């Protein structure tokens, strides 16, 4: 009945996408100069975690980051001089995500405890005290990104993303539509759109204001473990488990690039873009981080030096750092 209508409309969408595709990204970028053999060295080796790190988030001031690991400690890291500004004892020992606000006055954490904790950083007493305890998900939290100082957008294991009003603790918008466990979301540079990836290998972009889903991208096979917008806000890249990173387009709505290698069979758990956007760094699962030229789909460098899985990755807002975490309680910053 209606399922045949849905299938024929999917076929029409695919036909329109194929008719709208006339040149791949790699064919027109054959005449640009590559970045050569790029090499980066570990300038700082941040240490002090005693468990497996799962997430890290940078700051807009390009100096302070945060890191969340399995021991229930949230360490605020000063990258310049390898210092620890704050330590937050989390009630939940299980965290898969951590957020750092653009204002820098709020740090968030969440995970398998089904609660998005929000911590106040700039209190008058100096100590870090929890401000608002968000609730309303029936699954494990997996990503949280600060839209602004009063709005936070989270993804969870109940197959729905959610936009939150922090001062009320309510979900103003629920982003239903995922036929699978959504794990990673990233916000646009103009903070009005965001796109996420789920276990059903779908990349669904949403609207913050009204909640409608605009586009879907189902080019991947296994799942989507990571996602990160391009600096211009008109593209993004997605991690997976089938040893592939794929670039997706907001305006053309296709798959552009395939960042895959023959010998690579492991998964990707973190992706982030540089300030220019030509450099896409992916935290793989074969105990190293990789450099992917985002305009050529070739490997230009390797950020090795990790003895375990590179769970989280983040490029700072001014291009002056590449801070990657790992499962062996280490964060390291590359230049």
């Amino acid at each position: 009945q209606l399922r045949q209508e849905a299938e024929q409309l999917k076929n029409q969408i695919r036909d329109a996408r194929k008719a709208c595709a006339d040149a791949t990204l790699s064919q027109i970028t054959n005449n640009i100069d590559p970045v050569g053999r790029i090499q980066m060295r570990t300038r700082r080796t941040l240490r002090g975690h005693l468990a497996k790190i799962y997430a890290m988030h940078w700051g807009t001031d390009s100096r302070l980051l945060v890191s969340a690991s399995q021991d229930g400690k949230l360490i605020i890291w000063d990258s310049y001089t390898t210092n620890k500004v704050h330590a937050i004892p989390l009630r939940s020992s299980w965290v898969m995500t951590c957020a750092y606000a653009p204002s820098g006055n709020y740090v968030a954490c969440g995970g398998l405890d089904n609660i998005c904790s929000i911590y106040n950083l700039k209190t008058r007493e100096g100590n870090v005290r929890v401000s608002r305890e968000l609730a309303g998900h029936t699954g494990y939290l997996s990503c949280c990104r600060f839209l602004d100082d009063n709005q936070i957008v989270t993804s969870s294991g109940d197959t729905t993303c959610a936009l939150w009003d922090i001062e009320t603790g309510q979900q103003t918008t629920t982003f239903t539509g995922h036929t699978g466990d959504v794990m990673s979301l990233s916000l646009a540079p103009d903070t009005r759109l965001f796109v996420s990836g789920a276990c059903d290998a779908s990349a669904k972009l949403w609207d913050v204001r009204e909640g409608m889903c605009r586009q879907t991208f189902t080019g991947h096979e296994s799942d989507i473990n990571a996602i990160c917008f391009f600096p211009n806000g008109n593209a993004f890249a997605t991690g997976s488990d089938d040893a592939t990173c794929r670039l997706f387009d907001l305006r053309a709505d296709q798959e552009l690039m395939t960042y895959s290698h023959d010998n690579i069979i492991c998964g990707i758990t973190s992706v982030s873009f540089s300030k220019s956007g030509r450099l896409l760094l992916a935290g793989y699962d074969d105990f190293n981080c990789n450099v992917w030229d985002a305009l050529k789909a070739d490997r230009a460098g390797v950020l090795a030096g990790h003895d375990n899985r590179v769970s989280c990755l983040g490029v700072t807002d001014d291009g002056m750092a590449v801070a990657t975490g790992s499962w062996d309680s280490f964060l390291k910053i590359w230049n």
Binding site: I13, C20, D22, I28, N232, D249, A252, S276, G319
Partner: protein, 55 residues
């Protein structure tokens, strides 16, 4: 009962304007080459202004 709302969601996703891949990829390449001087990763800045240096 989700088949109906899946149909409305899919038909709302279908009728959107899509530009050609050549123009969009050219725009992506133009944004990459227009910020190449602001990226210390691609072009390594000298140590006189690098904020991560040994003690």
């Amino acid at each position: 009962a989700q088949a109906r709302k899946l149909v409305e969601q899919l038909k709302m996703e279908a009728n959107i304007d899509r530009i050609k891949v050549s123009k969009a990829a050219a725009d992506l390449m133009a944004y990459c080459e227009a910020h190449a001087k602001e990226d210390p990763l691609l072009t390594p800045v000298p140590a006189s202004e690098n904020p991560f240096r040994e003690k």
